[PDB]
Amino acid sequence: STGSATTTPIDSLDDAYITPVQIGTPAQTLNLDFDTGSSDLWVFSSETTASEVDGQTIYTPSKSTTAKLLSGATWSISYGDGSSSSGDVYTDTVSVGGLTVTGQAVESAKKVSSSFTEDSTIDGLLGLAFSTLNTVSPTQQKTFFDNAKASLDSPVFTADLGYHAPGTYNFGFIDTTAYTGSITYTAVSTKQGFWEWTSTGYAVGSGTFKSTSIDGIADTGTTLLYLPATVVSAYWAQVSGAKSSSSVGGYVFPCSATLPSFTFGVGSARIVIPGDYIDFGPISTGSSSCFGGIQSSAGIGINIFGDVALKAAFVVFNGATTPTLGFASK
Numbered sequence: 001s002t003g004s005a006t007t008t009p010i011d012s013l014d015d016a017y018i019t020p021v022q023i024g025t026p027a028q029t030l031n032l033d034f035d036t037g038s039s040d041l042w043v044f045s046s047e048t049t050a051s052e053v054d055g056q057t058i059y060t061p062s063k064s065t066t067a068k069l070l071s072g073a074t075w076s077i078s079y080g081d082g083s084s085s086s087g088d089v090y091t092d093t094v095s096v097g098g099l100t101v102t103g104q105a106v107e108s109a110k111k112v113s114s115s116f117t118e119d120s121t122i123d124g125l126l127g128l129a130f131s132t133l134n135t136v137s138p139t140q141q142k143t144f145f146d147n148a149k150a151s152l153d154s155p156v157f158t159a160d161l162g163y164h165a166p167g168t169y170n171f172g173f174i175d176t177t178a179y180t181g182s183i184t185y186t187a188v189s190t191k192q193g194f195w196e197w198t199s200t201g202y203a204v205g206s207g208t209f210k211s212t213s214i215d216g217i218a219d220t221g222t223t224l225l226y227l228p229a230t231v232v233s234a235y236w237a238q239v240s241g242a243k244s245s246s247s248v249g250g251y252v253f254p255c256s257a258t259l260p261s262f263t264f265g266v267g268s269a270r271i272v273i274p275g276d277y278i279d280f281g282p283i284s285t286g287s288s289s290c291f292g293g294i295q296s297s298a299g300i301g302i303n304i305f306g307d308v309a310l311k312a313a314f315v316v317f318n319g320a321t322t323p324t325l326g327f328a329s330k
């Protein structure tokens with residue numbers, strides 16, 4: 001089997017991407033944030049505290065003839081940005097782009113933190129990291145991809161995120177028309193439950209490539225590119241007037257600037273992020289200070305190849321017995 005679904009930016013900045021997901025019978029379609037940095041499929045629901053729902057579409061398990069309470073199971077997750085959610089668990093039929101999993105754990109939110117409530121466009125998350133990170137207790141549950149894998153034509157999914165435009169998540173096949181050149185594959189460590197890999201270096205603009213190992217995670221659920229402070233300082237030093245602002249929480253730059261590109265290495269291959277992908281717009285409405293799309297990972301504890309980086313590539317998440325990651329230009 002295969003599936004193919006379009007993923008759409010939630011706003012004009014590509015702050016996140018949403019993908020429609022069918023849950024239950026008859027189908028209830030919710031727009032979920034596909035997150036290769038976590039492993040829970042959770043949704044706003046008829047059980048979510050009413051004051052914490054503000055425009056989201058909710059899953060109502062009592063209206064699904066295939067929903068069954070997973071007795072005794074609960075979940076609770078905290079994300080790297082300080083947001084959180086928790087609740088109980090149903091199993092139900094879940095379909096993405098024509099690919100159907102029966103018995104998928106659907107984690108129903110009883111509580112969500114304020115940043116989820118305030119984002120009316122995101123109805124939940126669909127985790128695509130390794131199932132060892134799934135938070136369901138006392139019986140840990142499998143991700144949608146892990147449940148689908150045995151049925152897929154090939155045990156892979158691909159992320160093809162757009163810049164200020166829709167893109168595609170495919171399951172079970174590699175669309176050879178969706179990228180240019182060849183796909184370069186690189187080793188993955190699953191020890192932390194992430195799609196963790198090692199970039200071979202970077203360049204700023206037209207500058208020379210610096211060969212240096214940069215461990216980090218491929219995370220579709222993170223907006224920006226978080227890299228070591230040395231790398232980030234070298235990037236922003238090429239932008240007149242750019243500075244790290246403690247009050248804003250990262251590097252800002254004059255909105256009048258033209259940003260240089262940023263290149264990262266994948267083995268001997270190179271992925272070029274155009275400068276415009278690094279512009280996240282005014283820090284507040286009407287400001288001439290703009291927020292940068294490359295930020296320091298110092299204090300996060302891990303480097304994160306988020307959407308800023310991934311949207312410059314066609315990315316293969318190869319879930320074979322020994323997982324690997326593939327990157328191609330596009």
Ligand SMILES: CNCc1cc([N+](=O)[O-])ccc1Cl
Binds near residue numbers: 035083119122
């Ligand atoms: C932006 N804070 C909530 C949030 C977190 C994530 N996350 O992947 O951690 C995704 C979407 C939202 Cl709306």
